[PDB]
Subunit: 131 residues, 3 copies
């Protein structure tokens, strides 16, 4: 079970069908968020999560953001299972015109994925051949 | 097993070895096959997929797109296990020269991955 | 387990806690490199990996590269379980000011995730509803 702390009930991510890979995180701010071409603004979501250990949160743009020429500055967010702040979406305008955000509009998908333990490795001199 | 509907056999993804993470989705073009700097082109793959519940499809560029300065406009496709349309690749030219694409050229990769059930959550006042 | 071969000890990726999704891959080059607006550079990590079958490597930027307006030219690296070369990070500057990268600087994260076999499919005439 994932658990979710909402800074405000309207921050609640849009949940889809059972088959949905992700839930949509919403913008959360108290002033104008106007991302100029070639600039980025860190947009809070007002959603803080405990993602269970062994998993992590992948944050990517909603498909609607393609026509808006917004990307996450760091390409994709990676929310570790010990991260306790609210998720932030550092959104960059790679397009040619102003992008304005409406408070609570759904912007990014959060998909929770399993990951191999980063402790489970060994250093070696030679890798096994697959030529 | 993933069920795949092709609009035509030539839309068949390029499958690698057993160890390959992804399959290469192909352009299914009509007239426009070039993307100018700062422009985008919505490319149908002609591949519709039935992905088992509990998984999803991640659509990212092939590494060869790097050289060509093409990205997906929305960075990565997320194909839900109930999505039945064909997969689209909305490619944006972020570089400085035009990129001409050949029909059925391998552009993006589809990787099918597990995801947590988005219904499996609880809202909490506080958390540890 | 992930078998790792290092070109140089210092190429060792940064390992976080049990809670870390990925390990931080490092640049491996002698002098400081600068990447001008609109330009790209193919950074070797000096890390070759043997990822267990069933799994793959996803290489995305560190969150810190976001402010520096750097991306992987191909958006995200996909490391197959049969890839035996060193992982490369082809970094592109999409911003408007010069960025500089130093040796063994943590740049990208390598996350290792299960994938469905790409051989386990069937071409079908109709899908369900
Ligand atoms: Cl699509």
């Amino acid at each position: 079970m994932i658990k979710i702390k909402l800074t405000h009930p309207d921050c609640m991510p849009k949940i889809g069908s059972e088959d949905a890979a992700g839930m949509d995180l919403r913008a959360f701010f108290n002033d104008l968020r106007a991302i100029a071409p070639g600039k980025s603004l860190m947009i809070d979501t007002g959603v803080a999560v405990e993602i269970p250990r062994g998993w992590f949160g992948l944050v990517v743009p909603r498909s609607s953001l393609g026509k808006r020429h917004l990307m996450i500055a760091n390409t994709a967010g990676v929310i570790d299972s010990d991260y306790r702040g609210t998720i932030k979406m550092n959104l960059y305008n790679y397009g040619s015109e102003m992008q304005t955000l409406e408070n609570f509009e759904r912007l990014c998908q959060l998909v929770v994925l399993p990951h191999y333990s980063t402790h489970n490795f060994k250093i070696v001199d030679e890798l096994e051949e697959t030529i």
